[PDB]
Structure 1
Amino acid sequence: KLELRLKSPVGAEPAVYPWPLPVYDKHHDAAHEIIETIRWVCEEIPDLKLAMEYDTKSFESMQRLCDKYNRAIDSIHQLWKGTTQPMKLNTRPSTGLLRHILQQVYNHSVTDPEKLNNYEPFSPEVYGETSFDLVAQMIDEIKMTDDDLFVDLGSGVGQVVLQVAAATNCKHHYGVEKADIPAKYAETMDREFRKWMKWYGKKHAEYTLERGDFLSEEWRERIANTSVIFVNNFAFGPEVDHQLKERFANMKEGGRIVSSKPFAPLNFRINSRNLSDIGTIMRVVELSPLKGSVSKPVSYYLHTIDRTILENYFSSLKNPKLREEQEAA
């Protein structure tokens, strides 16, 4: 048996790979994961990048790369023992590193990715090469603080929950998934994610990947108490979207829902016939699309619970002037 090992930059257990190096799918294999890990650790640590003064099918050539990386790591650990300051260990991963870490967690967790169903509207042979970016855009645009609770509704193997948990301060992040196959992989994604984040010396916020149905009664109260919801509802039917509207109607003021299809018209106009529709209690905006993203770019929608829309309508009805105007129609 032959092996390649990469040392952890913070002294966790080394990553070990058998030779020949495994292929994970049509676009991912262990040789590129190794090269990319080396590259990313070099971004974490300048002196390492400096000190790194390649045929992926030659063992010797790949061992010469690993050896070189490992010797460089040893010398950086020595440097840290001296007066030099160690790497800050309390930090979150940059977006780029997080993309790599999640690909790596997915590689080791999702043993047969063909079993998982494609998430419309994204490409099926792409592994989040745009969904990852959209979520990244949202993480930046949506201020989240430690008083927030986050849910991804229908969370698959947990790819979005783990991204968001790596990046934000929400008190807790949840994913709820209904199907056996994705739920089982989520169990492993969790394990591998905790392990690889330790390996790179990075922190995440608390999260839980749970098995459940988000239309169940247990999730009624839980949706009600969530302040940020992500849901890729583009392919949902009108019955399921309707049931979600019922749940969203119980959210607290300021609650936010980001979706791929809006749950209410963007120019909702409140009157006697639409008094009970969800548009009476939320602002809806079309978010800024991300250049370099086909499906015409991917559009996405932010809803904010705001009952003052409804308060003003009722106040307007008490005013006989405004009341007469509305009765123009």
Structure 2
Amino acid sequence: LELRLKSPVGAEPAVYPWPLPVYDKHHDAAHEIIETIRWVCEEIPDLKLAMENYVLIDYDTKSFESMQRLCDKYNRAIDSIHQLWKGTNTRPSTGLLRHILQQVYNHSVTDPEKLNNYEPFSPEVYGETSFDLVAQMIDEIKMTDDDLFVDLGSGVGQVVLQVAAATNCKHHYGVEKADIPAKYAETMDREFRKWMKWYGKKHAEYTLERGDFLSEEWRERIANTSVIFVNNFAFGPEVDHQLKERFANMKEGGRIVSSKPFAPLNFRINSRNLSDIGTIMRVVELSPLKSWTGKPVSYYLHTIDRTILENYFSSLKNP
């Protein structure tokens, strides 16, 4: 007993077992199937035309026969479209990408309790505000093929996957130390590549790896990164201190996007604070509220700029 969805680009079909998996109290694989069919119909108008539209109204998620009929109508419509295309890879839309990331998560993180994460902006709630805030961050930073993006403490790798599907960075890296999210990240990686191929969508190169971003090997890797993403909101003072030391080796114009600033927003260089990281980096608070109707959230953009320090010294020598 199983259900199959043919790929719109002729990749291997998506296969679901019956009874269909349940994700939470109000979400399951049956809703995922219906939403997948709807998304494919949306971005392939010929499919929407060939598809018997009533089938998306009259379905019963608790009936194997009804769900099989729904999948069959979609599969026949896919077949008709493939016949039309017989007779003579872009990036996913923001809406499709939100769907893909949720789908990759539900097929990968089968036991979300094992994460032991009770925090806001955690893998289990990525769809609520994280996805929208990360999308805003992507639009604001405007990365190119010369950039290298790194998420320090990448969890199950959701930020890396979103950024890789949206930008043309040379490479995207996610580094995670904890065993359970790093293990889940391996499945997220496989599931993302599989689903992106199923939809026929392109993504930039990325790597999800297990490691300690405070290690010796990661010192030079942070120094060579042009865009660091770090959810440091709950980090201790020792980790924060160690991170500022790593950032102090970054190149001019290197950027850090974070949930808590690494230097004060109103930093004023003087003879008593020449040690502070604020001497070599600009910091700005970015808020989507400044057509955002979600949570009143903010993030912090840091830009390596050693002319802050140079200007202080030239001002002492040129009074």
Distance 2:190 2:79 in 1: 27
Q: Is the 8 A contact 1:281 1:306 kept in 2?
A: yes
Equivalent in the alignment of 2:233: 234
Normalised to the residue count of structure 1, the TM-score between the two structures is 0.90
Q: Is the 8 A contact 1:289 1:300 kept in 2?
A: no
Is 2:256 the counterpart of 1:257?
A: yes
- In the superposition, relative to structure 1, how do residues 3 and 296 fare at CA in structure 2: closer, same or farther (>3 Å)? closer
**Structure 1, unaligned stretches of length 5 or more?**
83-89, 321-329
- Secondary structure of the equivalent of 1:192? helix
Q: Is the 8 A contact 1:281 1:305 kept in 2?
A: yes
Q: Is the 8 A contact 1:291 1:297 kept in 2?
A: no
1:20: Cα distance to partner? 1.7
Q: Is the 8 A contact 2:98 2:127 kept in 1?
A: no
Q: Is the 8 A contact 1:23 1:30 kept in 2?
A: yes
Distance 1:206 1:118 in 2: 28
1:261: Cα distance to partner? 0.3
Deviates more, 1:128-137 or 1:242-251: 128-137
1:43: Cα distance to partner? 2.0
Deviates more, 1:66-75 or 1:40-49: 40-49
1:291: Cα distance to partner? 8.8
**Structure 2, unaligned stretches of length 5 or more?**
53-58
1:27: Cα distance to partner? 4.0
- In the superposition, relative to structure 1, how do residues 185 and 104 fare at CA in structure 2: closer, same or farther (>3 Å)? same
Q: Is the 8 A contact 1:121 1:295 kept in 2?
A: no
- In the superposition, relative to structure 1, how do residues 263 and 313 fare at CA in structure 2: closer, same or farther (>3 Å)? same
- In the superposition, relative to structure 1, how do residues 228 and 125 fare at CA in structure 2: closer, same or farther (>3 Å)? closer
Q: Is the 8 A contact 1:121 1:234 kept in 2?
A: no
Distance 1:125 1:163 in 2: 15
Equivalent in the alignment of 1:159: 158
Distance 1:44 1:58 in 2: 28
Cα deviation per residue 1:108-151 (whole Å; 9 max; x = unaligned)? 11121111132733378634321111111111111101111000
Distance 2:267 2:84 in 1: 62
Distance 1:223 1:49 in 2: 47
**What CA RMSD, in Å, does the superposition of the two structures yield over aligned residues?**
1.9
Q: Is the 8 A contact 1:234 1:260 kept in 2?
A: yes
- Secondary structure of the equivalent of 1:205? coil
Q: How many residues align?
A: 312
Cα deviation per residue 1:10-65 (whole Å; 9 max; x = unaligned)? 00111111112111233431101101110111122111123334221122221221
- In the superposition, relative to structure 1, how do residues 124 and 146 fare at CA in structure 2: closer, same or farther (>3 Å)? closer
1:195: Cα distance to partner? 0.6
- In the superposition, relative to structure 1, how do residues 158 and 124 fare at CA in structure 2: closer, same or farther (>3 Å)? closer
Normalised to the residue count of structure 2, the TM-score between the two structures is 0.93
Q: Is the 8 A contact 1:225 1:251 kept in 2?
A: yes
